[PDB]
């Protein structure tokens, strides 16, 4: 990145580490977690660090486990202003077939609703934990291989560990 480092150093990306030896960084190729990101009006980021935009108004499928069926996430888009080029996220629906085949729903506030029932946070069930983060944003955590973020005003995130 346009600056010099002595030999033997070990700078670390978020993903892994690299060490200087004979003017050539040696680097590991071990996987590191991805992050699909919804934000703004309609701006998506794939797990593979692709960026794009799709201003559709329906219930779209954001993510899903597709060899087995440990979960499935479903975004719900609506127009969000006077203009037609303004399509923000209103809610997201999560589905856990591992526990009751339940159906979590993150609402346009910081609210959550399991199977129609509004819920006070925290929600320690067996696997999934739902709690506030700054007391202004919800955070789902199923197991140790799944996280989420607030879908109040539309800034959904995910954290998928390399087991997926």
């Amino acid at each position: 990145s346009g600056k010099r480092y002595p030999p033997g150093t070990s700078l670390s990306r978020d993903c892994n580490t690299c060490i200087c030896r004979n003017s050539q960084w040696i680097c590991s190729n071990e996987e590191c977690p991805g992050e699909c990101l919804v934000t703004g009006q309609s701006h998506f980021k794939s797990f593979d660090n692709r960026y794009f935009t799709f201003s559709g108004i329906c219930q779209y499928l954001l993510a899903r486990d597709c060899q087995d069926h440990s979960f499935s996430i479903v975004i719900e888009t609506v127009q969000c202003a006077d203009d037609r080029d303004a399509v923000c996220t209103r809610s997201v629906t999560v589905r856990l077939p591992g526990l009751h085949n339940s159906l979590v729903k993150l609402k346009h506030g910081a609210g959550v609703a399991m199977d129609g029932q509004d819920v006070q946070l925290p929600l320690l069930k067996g696997d999934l934990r739902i709690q506030h983060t700054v007391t202004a944003s919800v955070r789902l955590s199923y197991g140790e291989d799944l996280q989420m973020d607030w879908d109040g005003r539309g800034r959904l995130l995910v954290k998928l560990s390399p087991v997926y």
Binding site: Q79, D82, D83, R84
Partner: protein, 82 residues
């Protein structure tokens, strides 16, 4: 933001005065606006935008009842939320 004098003719928009009342002609783009002394906006507009335009002065079609089609496209009965 820079106040200019009058008349003025930049970019194909002649900003003149006619009959003591101010005019803004855009014949290349197909419109003639003007204002009077009391203040009464007027917009003469060509037939090239037949069925095309939509705004606060409605679409240029033949009918007069459907010309509240919102920025989404919605025939609204109210002349106000439109």
């Amino acid at each position: 933001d820079q106040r200019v004098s009058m008349p003025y003719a930049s970019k194909g928009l002649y900003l003149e005065t006619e009959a003591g009342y101010y005019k803004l002609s855009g014949e290349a783009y197909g419109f003639v606006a003007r204002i009077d002394g009391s203040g009464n906006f007027q917009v003469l507009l060509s037939d090239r935008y037949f069925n095309k335009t939509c705004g606060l002065c409605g679409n240029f079609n033949i009918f007069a009842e459907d010309d509240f089609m919102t920025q989404e496209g919605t025939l609204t009965s109210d002349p106000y939320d439109f």
